[PDB]
mmCIF file of all heavy atoms in Angstrom:
data_model
loop_
_atom_site.group_PDB
_atom_site.id
_atom_site.type_symbol
_atom_site.label_atom_id
_atom_site.label_comp_id
_atom_site.label_asym_id
_atom_site.label_seq_id
_atom_site.Cartn_x
_atom_site.Cartn_y
_atom_site.Cartn_z
ATOM 1 N N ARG A 265 4.998 109.781 -147.956
ATOM 2 C CA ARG A 265 4.151 109.511 -149.093
ATOM 3 C C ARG A 265 4.024 110.737 -149.954
ATOM 4 O O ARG A 265 3.586 111.824 -149.496
ATOM 5 C CB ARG A 265 2.738 109.086 -148.609
ATOM 6 C CG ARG A 265 1.910 108.589 -149.837
ATOM 7 C CD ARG A 265 0.557 108.018 -149.558
ATOM 8 N NE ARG A 265 0.613 106.918 -148.578
ATOM 9 C CZ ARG A 265 0.798 105.615 -148.884
ATOM 10 N NH1 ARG A 265 0.972 105.222 -150.160
ATOM 11 N NH2 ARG A 265 0.770 104.743 -147.900
ATOM 12 N N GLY A 268 1.298 109.603 -154.136
ATOM 13 C CA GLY A 268 0.710 108.270 -153.902
ATOM 14 C C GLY A 268 1.677 107.118 -153.662
ATOM 15 O O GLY A 268 1.261 105.950 -153.828
ATOM 16 N N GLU A 269 2.897 107.363 -153.285
ATOM 17 C CA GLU A 269 3.854 106.277 -153.001
ATOM 18 C C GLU A 269 4.734 106.718 -151.856
ATOM 19 O O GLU A 269 4.994 107.890 -151.749
ATOM 20 C CB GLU A 269 4.811 106.035 -154.181
ATOM 21 C CG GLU A 269 4.187 105.625 -155.479
ATOM 22 C CD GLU A 269 3.774 104.198 -155.551
ATOM 23 O OE1 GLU A 269 3.841 103.413 -154.570
ATOM 24 O OE2 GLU A 269 3.384 103.827 -156.681
ATOM 25 N N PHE A 270 5.203 105.778 -151.049
ATOM 26 C CA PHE A 270 6.248 106.124 -150.068
ATOM 27 C C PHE A 270 7.597 106.254 -150.815
ATOM 28 O O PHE A 270 7.980 105.340 -151.512
ATOM 29 C CB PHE A 270 6.403 105.042 -149.014
ATOM 30 C CG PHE A 270 5.302 104.975 -147.995
ATOM 31 C CD1 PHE A 270 4.516 103.827 -147.906
ATOM 32 C CD2 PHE A 270 5.065 106.059 -147.117
ATOM 33 C CE1 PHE A 270 3.506 103.778 -146.913
ATOM 34 C CE2 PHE A 270 4.022 106.029 -146.153
ATOM 35 C CZ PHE A 270 3.237 104.888 -146.049
ATOM 36 N N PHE A 321 3.744 98.955 -143.826
ATOM 37 C CA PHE A 321 4.182 98.792 -145.197
ATOM 38 C C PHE A 321 5.587 98.153 -145.299
ATOM 39 O O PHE A 321 5.841 97.249 -146.100
ATOM 40 C CB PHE A 321 4.196 100.205 -145.893
ATOM 41 C CG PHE A 321 4.645 100.250 -147.302
ATOM 42 C CD1 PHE A 321 3.732 99.991 -148.325
ATOM 43 C CD2 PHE A 321 5.983 100.483 -147.616
ATOM 44 C CE1 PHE A 321 4.161 99.952 -149.672
ATOM 45 C CE2 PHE A 321 6.431 100.452 -148.963
ATOM 46 C CZ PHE A 321 5.538 100.201 -149.976
HETATM 47 CL CL1 LIG B 614 0.651 101.759 -150.509
#
Side-chain angles (χ1 to χ4, degrees):
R265 187 175 305 271
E269 298 283 5
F270 286 119
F321 179 86

